[PDB]
Amino acid sequence: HVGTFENITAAPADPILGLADLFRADERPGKINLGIGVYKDETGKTPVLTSVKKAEQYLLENETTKNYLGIDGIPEFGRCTQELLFGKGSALINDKRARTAQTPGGTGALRVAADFLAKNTSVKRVWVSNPSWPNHKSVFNSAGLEVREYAYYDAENHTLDFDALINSLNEAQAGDVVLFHGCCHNPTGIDPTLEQWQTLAQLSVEKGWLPLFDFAYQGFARGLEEDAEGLRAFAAMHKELIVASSYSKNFGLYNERVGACTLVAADSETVDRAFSQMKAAIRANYSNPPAHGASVVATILSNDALRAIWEQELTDMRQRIQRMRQLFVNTLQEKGANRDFSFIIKQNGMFSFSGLTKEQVLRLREEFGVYAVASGRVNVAGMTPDNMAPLCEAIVAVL
Amino acid sequence: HVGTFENITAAPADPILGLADLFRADERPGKINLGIGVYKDETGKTPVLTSVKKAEQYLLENETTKNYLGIDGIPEFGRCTQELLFGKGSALINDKRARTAQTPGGTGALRVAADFLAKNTSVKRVWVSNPSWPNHKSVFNSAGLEVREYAYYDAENHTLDFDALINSLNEAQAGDVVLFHGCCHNPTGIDPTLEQWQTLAQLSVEKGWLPLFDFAYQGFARGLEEDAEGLRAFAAMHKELIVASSYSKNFGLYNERVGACTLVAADSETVDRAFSQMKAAIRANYSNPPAHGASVVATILSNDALRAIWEQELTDMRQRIQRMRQLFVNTLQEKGANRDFSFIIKQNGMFSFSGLTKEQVLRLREEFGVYAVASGRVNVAGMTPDNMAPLCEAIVAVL
Numbered sequence: 001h002v003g004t005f006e007n008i009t010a011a012p013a014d015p016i017l018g019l020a021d022l023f024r025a026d027e028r029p030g031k032i033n034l035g036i037g038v039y040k041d042e043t044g045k046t047p048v049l050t051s052v053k054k055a056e057q058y059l060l061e062n063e064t065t066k067n068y069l070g071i072d073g074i075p076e077f078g079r080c081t082q083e084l085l086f087g088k089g090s091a092l093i094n095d096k097r098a099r100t101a102q103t104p105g106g107t108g109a110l111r112v113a114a115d116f117l118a119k120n121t122s123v124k125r126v127w128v129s130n131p132s133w134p135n136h137k138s139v140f141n142s143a144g145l146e147v148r149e150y151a152y153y154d155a156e157n158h159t160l161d162f163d164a165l166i167n168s169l170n171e172a173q174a175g176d177v178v179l180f181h182g183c184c185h186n187p188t189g190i191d192p193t194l195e196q197w198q199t200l201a202q203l204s205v206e207k208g209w210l211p212l213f214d215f216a217y218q219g220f221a222r223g224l225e226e227d228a229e230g231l232r233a234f235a236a237m238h239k240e241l242i243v244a245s246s247y248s249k250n251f252g253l254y255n256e257r258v259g260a261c262t263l264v265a266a267d268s269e270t271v272d273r274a275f276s277q278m279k280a281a282i283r284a285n286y287s288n289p290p291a292h293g294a295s296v297v298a299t300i301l302s303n304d305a306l307r308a309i310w311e312q313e314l315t316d317m318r319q320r321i322q323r324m325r326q327l328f329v330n331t332l333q334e335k336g337a338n339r340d341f342s343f344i345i346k347q348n349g350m351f352s353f354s355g356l357t358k359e360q361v362l363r364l365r366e367e368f369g370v371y372a373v374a375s376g377r378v379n380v381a382g383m384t385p386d387n388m389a390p391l392c393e394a395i396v397a398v399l
Numbered sequence: 400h401v402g403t404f405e406n407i408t409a410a411p412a413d414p415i416l417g418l419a420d421l422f423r424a425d426e427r428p429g430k431i432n433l434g435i436g437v438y439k440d441e442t443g444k445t446p447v448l449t450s451v452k453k454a455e456q457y458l459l460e461n462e463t464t465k466n467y468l469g470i471d472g473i474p475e476f477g478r479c480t481q482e483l484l485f486g487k488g489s490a491l492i493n494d495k496r497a498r499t500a501q502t503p504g505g506t507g508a509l510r511v512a513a514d515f516l517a518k519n520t521s522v523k524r525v526w527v528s529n530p531s532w533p534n535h536k537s538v539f540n541s542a543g544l545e546v547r548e549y550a551y552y553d554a555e556n557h558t559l560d561f562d563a564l565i566n567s568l569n570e571a572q573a574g575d576v577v578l579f580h581g582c583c584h585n586p587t588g589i590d591p592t593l594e595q596w597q598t599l600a601q602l603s604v605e606k607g608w609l610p611l612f613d614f615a616y617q618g619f620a621r622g623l624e625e626d627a628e629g630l631r632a633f634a635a636m637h638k639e640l641i642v643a644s645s646y647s648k649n650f651g652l653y654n655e656r657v658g659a660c661t662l663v664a665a666d667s668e669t670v671d672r673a674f675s676q677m678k679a680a681i682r683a684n685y686s687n688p689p690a691h692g693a694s695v696v697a698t699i700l701s702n703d704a705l706r707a708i709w710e711q712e713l714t715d716m717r718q719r720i721q722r723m724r725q726l727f728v729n730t731l732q733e734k735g736a737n738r739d740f741s742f743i744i745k746q747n748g749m750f751s752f753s754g755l756t757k758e759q760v761l762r763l764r765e766e767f768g769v770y771a772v773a774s775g776r777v778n779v780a781g782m783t784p785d786n787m788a789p790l791c792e793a794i795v796a797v798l
């Protein structure tokens with residue numbers, strides 16, 4: 001008998017995670033990693049946060065069992081998540097209109113939402129910004145949903161093309177899903193203003209879209225509450241919406257897989273009925289979620305002393321990134337760059353489109369050992385005072 | 400505009416995991432939970448293993464980052480898994496014919512296999528035993544695969560109906576998947592003898608089946624090496640197979656979601672090509688796996704001192720369950736049962752497949768506060784010297 005595996009074609013490498021493999025194998029001591037969206041401190045390391053180490057020590061000494069969690073995970077984790085998203089005292093919470101499942105990362109929350117939609121509703125299409133995180137299309141396609149693109153970025157002016165966005169979204173039908181990044185758009189770092197969020201919200205209710213927010217960077221633009229203003233404007237108007245959030249980055253808990261999928265419906269009866277099918281889709285995927293990382297998050301957010309430490313550590317990360325953006329722009333001019341790079345200062349989060357071509361990005365890797373994503377996305381949080389000069393010298397050399 | 404969630408039909412509660420909610424709600428003193436397949440010690444608790452606590456302390460002291468794992472997880476965890484399944488010195492390992500991905504539990508391993516098969520192969524059908532773990536059908540159906548049932552249990556003699564198993568797999572075609580439980584069949588506790596495994600291995604290769612082993616209880620039947628004899632008989636004859644394994648039960652790590660999906664192909668070039676598509680399926684689901692639980696397992700298995708402690712803790716679990724099986728049968732007799740329950744002594748693993756009707760299971764719950772699965776599956780590892788007498792008085796009353 002001829003093998004079931006014999007004719008499988010090899011998959012292409014992941015445009016983000018495959019870069020990490022290349023970078024690890026590179027033997028040059030001066031190599032610089034500006035690819036995957038992981039925070040680095042001023043020393044070039046990705047430490048465990050102190051708030052997280054303290055919570056892990058508490059868990060080690062007080063955990064008495066590893067018995068399965070419920071399908072939807074730790075109850076306090078879900079309550080804390082809804083407060084962060086919608087704010088204490090939200091009507092969504094007091095009206096009992098939201099349900100939250102703890103999930104393995106924000107990616108797991110996206111896939112659970114996608115599986116839930118494909119198997120229990122009439123949804124067929126998901127609209128995603130052009131550009132967006134490369135894995136969005138793969139997640140939704142693998143659940144059986146079609147992915148469509150709406151305009152977003154003006155590469156000439158390095159801004160949000162708001163007229164193009166609205167014009168292209170006038171093709172999205174009632175009952176389509178439209179995906180928004182909550183803040184720190186990946187990869188452009190360009191977010192709507194509050195006014196623009198409010199225009200999109202009113203339009204959304206008018207056209208009958210089902211909003212789906214990918215919220216992986218709460219706290220990295222302006223602040224925890226400020227970064228949720230856009231979501232909270234949608235939540236004020238809509239009967240229905242979905243939020244896939246991640247604690248990977250704002251808690252530095254990447255590899256423990258901590259995220260949440262939050263369902264909102266018009267009333268308590270409908271959301272409980274829908275959440276019953278969300279739980280069924282989870283059960284047929286990974287059964288129930290991993291406890292360690294989510295237990296850490298719930299411990300930190302439940303304890304005023306740990307939460308105050310964590311909030312300061314998040315502010316420090318946010319502010320260090322802002323300092324590197326300015327240093328990056330200033331150092332490019334000193335190293336001989338002709339172009340104006342000041343638009344970098346206007347972008348939020350870890351990421352920015354550098355304006356570099358695929359050929360230039362390739363040269364940076366092969367000739368200078370500087371690793372960026374082929375789209376020209378660079379991770380500013382991977383820049384340090386010590387690697388800024390060689391990094392900038394390399395960019396000027398390929399311009 | 401009509402809501403997207405209005406037309407949703409509620410899902411029923413899980414036949415196993417829903418029991419926890421029903422049991423927690425029950426206010427009657429002395430209620431007994433014989434439902435979900437977790438181990439309990441002599442005091443009715445599910446403690447963290449000492450070997451696990453020691454490993455967690457080492458990780459707390461030595462972890463310096465939570466940076467993402469690769470898509471397939473901790474390399475050392477994969478190597479230790481293959482040695483455990485196939486044996487040190489296995490030709491499958493020496494010839495590099497196996498690749499392993501760390502997954503979120505055994506369930507996650509089954510789902511990754513299902514998504515991989517549906518996307519990349521001509522597999523259309525999966526054969527599972529009647530009875531089986533109820534979530535098998537849900538996992539494979541979630542990828543759009545047809546699930547058929549083969550005969551397995553002789554409810555009259557409380558044995559394996561080997562003639563009917565053979566006859567009922569007659570219509571399983573080349574390229575169909577046939578799912579086998581590695582040991583401690585869930586729910587029956589009846590496993591093939593070595594002679595029966597060898598017969599099935601030869602038949603499988605003559606008919607061209609793709610075997611898939613679900614290995615959730617290695618070490619709970621007779622021992623770690625002994626429980627793998629059937630898989631190793633298959634592995635000696637087959638070019639291709641898949642193993643989904645779990646460390647939830649034999650390490651007591653249920654809620655940290657520690658499992659593995661192992662792919663075996665004819666040669667290194669083929670398995671690497673197929674594995675690249677399995678990694679693609681993981682990336683579009685939960686991206687990469689949770690570190691904490693798998694790090695514990697890898698630490699324990701790669702340290703001779705910790706591994707010896709763990710192997711003794713697993714022996715202690717196995718022996719307590721065997722003692723309770725015998726006490727259960729003796730006490731049923733003491734309490735006046737006229738039905739012969741001696742077949743329970745011949746079953747393996749955490750459970751006894753008692754033959755009680757759905758009607759009798761509902762009556763135990765509602766009238767005596769004793770909780771079993773509606774198939775009549777009872778968790779022997781939930782029995783203690785303190786609850787055995789009332790448990791048996793209740794069963795005798797509904798007979």
Ligand SMILES: *Cc1c(COP(=O)(O)O)cnc(C)c1O
Binds near residue numbers: 106108181214216257
């Ligand atoms: C990081 C990221 C994710 C994935 O989050 P994980 O928790 O690592 O799975 C999803 N969407 C966006 C935009 C991200 O930046």
Ligand SMILES: *Cc1c(COP(=O)(O)O)cnc(C)c1O
Binds near residue numbers: 653
């Ligand atoms: C427990 C069990 C599983 C699931 O294991 P998890 O690690 O909890 O996902 C799968 N198959 C069988 C037969 C089981 O008994």
